[PDB]
Design a protein around this ligand. Structure first.
Ligand SMILES: Nc1nc2c(ncn2[C@@H]2O[C@H](COP(=O)(O)OP(=O)(O)OP(=O)(O)O)[C@@H](O)[C@H]2O)c(=O)[nH]1
Ligand SMILES: Nc1nc2c(ncn2[C@@H]2O[C@H](COP(=O)(O)OP(=O)(O)OP(=O)(O)O)[C@@H](O)[C@H]2O)c(=O)[nH]1
Ligand SMILES: Nc1nc2c(ncn2[C@@H]2O[C@H](COP(=O)(O)OP(=O)(O)O)[C@@H](O)[C@H]2O)c(=O)[nH]1
Ligand SMILES: [Mg+2]
Ligand SMILES: [Mg+2]
Lengths: 426, 37, 428, 201, 201, 428
């Protein structure tokens, strides 16, 4: 049946990918040694959506691990659930991109392109046909952004009609390391606006906020934020893996949420999210599941949606549920927040129901939403890019590896058109 | 064995065919000239 | 002899169909294996040791609901290629239903229909169940009706398509999918009967006081409706109602066949222990606008024709006393060119209750299907929220870039606008 | 003698069944050694079968049921994949009917004692324990071996673990459901267990 | 075989019916295995049901009832919330009439003996002591689970504690009362307890 | 008295003889030693004390498939010299397989075909199963058909030639071997029947739903074809069809002797008990164009003869009733000089299902052999493939230097085009 092919680039993609397959195998009851435990039909009826049998009964993820520095490949393999992947899908670079777009996209990212497209074709053409691609990478550095988005382009002259999930993390608004942030971010953005079917963004300071005030963690590490993102990873895709009263998939999401092909940017979120002692104190029912969901703190983006206007929206659902009250509360939030939704699309909400909850929960929700409030955070990337551009700073790292000046000017003009078309829909 | 003859010497069929019915539910009715109970 | 073929396109058709056939199996006595521990002929076939296999096809472009029926309880009741499945979902798109995926599944679909129809003469018609808001229920649902008119011309084709609500629709591009399905089924559907999900939600909340039921509880109530329509086809009764006068009694003009429904009594066991169930009040409940089946208010709609299907221990005397009461009643107004307005059909079999369901064991019931002018408003709200979103090219690039050209939207727009003018002209 | 000649079940079948043939010939023209279809054996002794409530049923209870053996191993990943769908096919087959149709007897290819109880706690059908020699003579009769450690008498391994073997009252190989064979129909080979025809009688 | 194929009370059923059906087979065209309609169990034996002030109460005391089974835990606050609601309902239903209509059989999930006596003292209906194997042979039969600890044969989580299960003569699930189910509707689903159709015969 | 002699050449012929005699032994009660624990006289001869012995020759110049048969289970059933083995492979070479390496095995084969056909007079005919794409299946098959024609000219020459598919050809020199073989298949073969591999591949893929089938499952289907072929010859029936009836009812011109084949029902246990496989439901699937066993699409061809043979408890009432609806449907069409085109045979004994195979225990079956104008297409792409690769002398040196001469290819090209001009001459 349908198989989605997973692609992880950058050191961020290696460890969000490891936490991804830790949660997906936790849902599917898969031992890290490759076997299956759980004696349940409904796990194993959709395994080919993410795994492949290996003539010993063991399941290998159809994921590709990608970096130019094997330090992050070593950390993935040595940890738990690192003996699940094949070692052939780990493509190794030995030089490493030092937070340079030109190093990972044009000069030293290029020699690893032909060694990884045949890895993509190994299982994309290894099946009869695939449902789509699911790439997740980083834009703050070089080996995630330049290598990742060049992979996005080269798989579209081969698979033009196939869907393109991209989970791209964005530079920090407030406390940013990697002092060359904005060049790598902007060089990603004007390239991905024409060759990504749907972009759905993540910000680390939003995940810090979730771990702080709605989870109350005194010391959240990077794996805690990775578990938050990985929960939204299984949420957007489990409607294929499990049945439900109202089935959906990723092509369901793209056609319902993209009225215009130049705008495909989304907020991401996941609920319920309760603290240590408040897990037994709080009711778990669909009125409050939606009431927490459409809040500024719940989103995994550095954008306040109340400043913007929800253009199109979609929340999937999981678990033992009931079908009017999943829907009429999307009516309720459309009727109270009548100023937070656009008026020239009637009933801006997509609702889908999956009958399987995640492990440990009995109902849950994963909301993606094409909001125009994301324009607020292309602006802070853009005006910090052009503040450093007129200074003529740090472009000798970029033009010393075979990049023209005029591609940077095309970066500013394309993102200026991106924010201009989002503004007039408000 | 070939299929057997389905006609007697009287020259008439040998076995009936049950007609395609309609799940007959009866109706209790009788009236006029005493008109019962 | 008599046989009727049921077609279910889309996963809305699947979920309405599994509950529709589990009632038929409990109505005739078919175990989940297809054995009878003779009216099965009009819905269940035969193949030796009681094997009463079904006469229904189950179309879906995605497999995620069809093969879990194969995994579920009803494996060996259904013939395995009667359950027909593709690989990829149409995903709320008329173009994805027609020109890219549906062209490869419709050849095997009509192959199965042809084999399942040529088994015995006596085919009354086709019962279509679909979702007009969906992608395969509307797109592939259209192309099946195109290929059924080209070969099976003079056969009746009933329709029960789930129209979306003004409020609960769970999609955004159902303005596109629904009004392209109208351009299908004004000229291909013989009798169209309208359905709506909140019009079943508000019946479940009020008439049974069930605060949290699901999609499957809607499917029992509609299964009782279709079983009541085929009550006279299978069981015996005083007034026989087969399919040929659902159209010649309810359709006065060939472009006027969109019509409404209602079911009564919908009463739980805890309310049937106090209310007496008389024939006079069950049809009075079937005339209430709040008891309606597709959320179409009949105070501003004007009843051209009606059909009543009494099922149970209904004496014909109080049939005629109750229907004389509604002619006296002023708030249900009828048309001056159709002074008579009623076709009545009595069947002696009581309604079959499902254990573990929502309904109780009642001794009498009504299934009312009424063609009224009130169907003008369910398309006028379709007018308002189509032009409100078509005006700025939203969600158009998905359709135009996938086979179908710009301009078919405008002629389907003029099609339902012509339907608006037809209903206004007949309602004078 | 079927399907194999070199198996402990069938050579004990031959030894027992012309044993009483000499005895009734001395008691009495009789045709010796008796023909294969005239041969009748016992397949499961009095204290062999064991249902989920840990009580014993003789072989006479299975008559009129399409019974099939099930060789499985706890640590094998293929076996842990066949076990849920075999449980579901054992479930929905018999629930959707008015008559018990299929039955499964479990034979174990597992290392030791405590690992067998963990695997046996998951299925609701019959089972045979390791220390019974009936398990040893069963997979040496249907030739179900994960590896060649026991010397097989000119054959090869007929099938790999897991496998379900539709059996008869004479130990007959009625049909093979192709899980690990030349068809290699994993996860779907089950949709071919003719519940009829094959009927341990 | 209702409602669960893998039920252990139901395999305790089958061992008995086609035990004696093999006996009329050998004493005398009898259908083996017997059809699902015709097995007759005994659900509550002579020493299982206890009434108030602990005297023996047998199964012959239950004809003409609508009998339902009240799974409960003493320290579960869900059972604590619903217990006074069902005390009032069991009073007015079973007193307000011309006949003694409904009946509740208590089955326990308590920690120990002290937890059993404390919770029993607030229930006037019938009950089952925890030391009987009846409380475990029936808990798996009607699919009632506290958490996933007892090894199951591919069931689901039909209900959590508490649960009221209206039953029939042969262990058939008559109709579920959804206090905590897919309906998720609290402390009013006991009003859904019809009694005309769900007669213990 | 009455006997039929089967002849198998090539590796494909040997294993197609293994399947059809696994079946014929299984229906006649023949153990693999031949001991019964007079209808057997066609395929088995009484030898000694209750032993029945095969009536064939197994022919192959390479030993690699034949000597593994004589070490198998059926090794004390077969006579040792009926299985005739060579020493070296013909190796896809008509020049070696006819002239060079095939001349020292014909003297043993004609000795055994004499010793097998001289025991009784009234021999019913010879059957031939050859691989067209093979080396010894084409070369040795051609020369021994030539020698049995000069010896026994007035006896029937059946042939079920396994043709290469348009896309499945599993070699490279199938244009040379098949075109050279059909030069003599045209001239001294009384009956030719095409058995294309990919057509039977597809039939197992959808009807029997095996998506990894092997040459075993291909061979069982041919075994069912030959079993319902000679069912009327072996057992009694309501209406006999002899092997002499075939050419008199399917061959109106001596050059046109190339017909088709189809077997239905080929349902699987799972799908079996789900259809009333009636004398019609099974004759409609027999005439289905995709149920073809040689992938010759007949919608662009005109039927010029057809023979149907029913096998089971078949009443001829619905034989005549179902064949009338075949005659009336316009998707099928007959050439106007045969207003009737139907020869029917009826056998009472039902087909016997092999254990562990892929069919089911089916009470009634149909095998249908039709001559058509649609044989012109299998030779028309044969024209394309041969000229496309004969153009620049490819693989020619394996034939010229190994026995034949430059010009055999030109005349084998010419007489196949003469077959096309003859077929379209019928086709007006
Ligand atoms: N009454 C009822 N309506 C349903 C049911 N399932 C889906 N629907 C309706 O169908 C709409 C969504 O479209 P679907 O039916 O799921 O999609 P589809 O018609 O199968 O076509 P695809 O989108 O390509 O899958 C919802 O808004 C519902 O109104 C159901 O089980 N019962
Ligand atoms: N119908 C059918 N045809 C087969 C089968 N196996 C092989 N063939 C045909 O045989 C052809 C190849 O020739 P072989 O039969 O393998 O060999 P051969 O006939 O002995 O002649 P050589 O090639 O010289 O060895 C292929 O093109 C197939 O079309 C089979 O199982 N069934
Ligand atoms: N979402 C997410 N972001 C991360 C994670 N680890 C690091 N980052 C961010 O990624 C940036 C570091 O870029 P990096 O991947 O090291 O550069 P690269 O190796 O050249 O791609 C920092 O700004 C971090 O905020 C993670 O686990 N998840
Ligand atoms: Mg769709
Ligand atoms: Mg050859």
């Amino acid at each position: 049946m349908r198989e989605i092919v997973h692609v992880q680039g950058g050191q961020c993609g290696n460890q969000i990918g490891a936490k991804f397959w830790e949660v997906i195998s936790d849902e599917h009851g898969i031992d890290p040694t490759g076997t299956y435990c759980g004696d349940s039909d409904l796990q194993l009826e959709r395994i080919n959506v993410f795994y492949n049998e290996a003539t010993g009964g063991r399941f290998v993820p159809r994921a590709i691990l990608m970096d130019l520095e094997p330090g992050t490949m070593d950390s993935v393999r040595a940890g738990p659930f690192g003996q699940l992947f094949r070692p052939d899908n780990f493509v190794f670079g030995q030089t490493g991109a030092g937070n340079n777009w030109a190093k990972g996209h044009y000069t030293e990212g290029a020699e690893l392109i032909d060694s990884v497209l045949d890895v993509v074709r190994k299982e994309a053409e290894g099946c009869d046909c695939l449902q789509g691609f699911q790439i997740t990478h980083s834009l703050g550095g070089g080996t995630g952004s330049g290598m990742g988005t060049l992979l996005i382009s080269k798989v579209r002259e081969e698979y033009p009609d196939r869907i393109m999930e991209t989970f791209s993390v964005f530079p920090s608004p407030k406390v940013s390391d990697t002092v060359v942030e904005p060049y790598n971010a902007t060089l990603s953005v004007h390239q991905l606006v024409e060759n990504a079917d749907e972009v759905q963004v993540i910000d680390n300071e939003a995940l810090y906020d979730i771990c702080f005030r709605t989870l109350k963690l005194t010391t959240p590490t990077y794996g805690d934020l990775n578990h938050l993102v990985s929960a939204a990873m299984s949420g957007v895709t489990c409607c294929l893996r499990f049945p439900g009263q109202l089935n959906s998939d990723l092509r369901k999401l793209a056609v319902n949420l993209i009225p215009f092909p130049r705008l495909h940017f989304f907020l991401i979120g996941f609920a319920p999210l309760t603290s240590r002692g408040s897990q037994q104190y709080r009711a778990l029912s669909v009125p409050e599941l939606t009431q927490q969901m459409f809040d500024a703190k719940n989103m995994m983006c550095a954008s306040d949606p109340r400043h913007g206007r929800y253009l199109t929206a979609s929340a999937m659902f999981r678990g033992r549920m009931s079908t009017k009250e999943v829907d009429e509360q999307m009516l309720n939030v459309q009727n109270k927040n009548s100023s937070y939704f656009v008026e020239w699309i009637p009933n801006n909400m997509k609702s889908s129901v999956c009958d399987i909850p995640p492990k440990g929960l009995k109902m849950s929700v994963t909301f993606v939403g094409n909001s125009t409030a994301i324009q607020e955070m292309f602006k802070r990337v853009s005006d910090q890019f052009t503040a450093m551009f007129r200074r003529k700073a740090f472009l000798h790292w970029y033009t010393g590896e075979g990049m023209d000046e005029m591609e940077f000017t095309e970066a500013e003009s394309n993102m200026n058109d991106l924010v201009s078309e989002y503004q007039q829909y408000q | 064995s070939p299929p057997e003859s389905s006609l007697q010497s009287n020259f008439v069929p040998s076995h009936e065919e049950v007609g395609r019915h309609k799940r007959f539910l009866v109706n209790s009715r009788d009236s006029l000239q005493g008109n019962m109970i | 002899m008599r046989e009727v073929i049921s077609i279910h396109v889309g996963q809305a058709g699947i979920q309405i169909g599994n509950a529709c056939w589990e009632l038929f199996c409990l109505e005739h006595g078919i175990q989940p294996d297809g054995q009878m521990p003779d009216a099965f002929n009009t819905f269940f076939s035969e193949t030796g040791a009681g094997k009463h296999v079904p006469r229904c096809v189950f179309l879906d472009l995605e497999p995620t609901v069809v093969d879990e029926v194969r995994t579920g309880t009803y494996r060996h009741l259904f013939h395995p290629e009667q359950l027909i499945s593709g690989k990829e979902d149409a995903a709320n798109n008329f173009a994805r239903g027609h020109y890219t995926i549906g062209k490869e599944i419709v050849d095997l679909s009509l192959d199965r229909i042809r084999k399942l129809a040529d088994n015995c003469t006596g085919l009354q018609g086709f019962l279509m169940f679909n979702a007009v808001g969906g992608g395969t229920g509307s797109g592939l649902g259209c192309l099946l009706l195109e290929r059924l008119s080209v070969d099976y011309g003079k056969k009746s084709k009933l329709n029960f398509c789930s129209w979306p609500s003004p409020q609960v629709s769970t999609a955004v591009v159902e303005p596109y999918n629904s009004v392209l399905s109208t351009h299908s089924l004004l000229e291909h559907t013989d009798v169209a009967v309208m359905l709506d999900n909140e019009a079943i939600y508000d019946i479940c909340r009020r008439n049974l006081d069930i605060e949290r039921p699901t999609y499957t509880n809607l499917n029992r109530l509609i299964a009782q409706v279709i079983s009541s329509l085929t009550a006279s086809l299978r069981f015996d009764g005083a007034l026989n109602v087969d399919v040929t006068e659902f159209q010649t009694n309810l359709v006065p003009y060939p472009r006027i066949h969109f019509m409404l429904s209602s079911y009564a009594p919908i009463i739980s066991a805890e309310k049937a222990y106090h209310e007496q169930l008389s024939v006079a009040e069950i049809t009075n409940s079937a005339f209430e606008p709040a008891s309606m089946m597709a959320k179409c208010d009949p105070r501003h709609g004007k009843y051209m024709a009606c059909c009543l299907m009494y099922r149970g221990d209904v004496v014909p005397k109080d049939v005629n006393a109750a229907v004389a009461t509604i002619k006296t009643k002023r708030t249900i107004q009828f048309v001056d060119w159709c002074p008579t307005g009623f076709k009545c059909g009595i069947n002696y079999q009581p309604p079959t209750v499902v254990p573990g369901g929502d309904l109780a064991k009642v001794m009498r019931a009504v299934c009312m299907i009424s063609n009224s002018t009130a169907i003008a408003e369910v398309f006028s709200r379709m007018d308002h929220k189509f032009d409100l979103m078509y005006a700025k090219r939203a969600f158009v690039h998905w359709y135009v870039g996938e086979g179908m050209e710009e301009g078919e939207f405008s002629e389907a727009r003029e099609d339902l606008a012509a339907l608006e003018k037809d209903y206004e002209e007949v309602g004078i | 003698s079927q399907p194999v000649f070199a198996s402990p079940l069938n050579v004990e079948k031959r030894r027992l069944n012309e044993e009483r043939a000499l005895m009734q010939a001395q008691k009495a023209n009789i045709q010796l050694p008796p023909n294969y279809g005239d041969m009748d054996l016992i397949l499961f002794p009095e204290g062999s079968l064991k249902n989920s409530n840990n009580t014993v049923i003789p072989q006479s209870h299975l008559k009129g049921k399409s019974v099939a053996l099930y060789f499985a191993d706890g640590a094998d990943p293929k076996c842990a994949s066949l076990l849920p769908f075999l449980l579901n096919y054992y479930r929905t087959m018999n629930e959707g009917g008015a008559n018990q149709k299929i039955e499964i007897i479990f034979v174990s290819l597992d290392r030791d004692r405590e690992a067998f109880e963990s695997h046996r706690a998951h299925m609701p059908w019959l089972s045979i324990d390791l220390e019974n020699p009936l398990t040893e003579i069963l997979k040496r009769h249907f030739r179900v071996m994960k590896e060649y450690e026991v010397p097989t008498y000119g054959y090869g391994s007929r099938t790999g673990v897991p496998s379900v073997i539709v059996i008869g009252s004479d130990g007959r190989e009625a049909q093979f459901l192709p899980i690990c064979s030349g068809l290699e129909e994993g996860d779907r080979a089950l949709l071919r267990w003719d519940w009829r025809n094959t009927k341990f009688a």
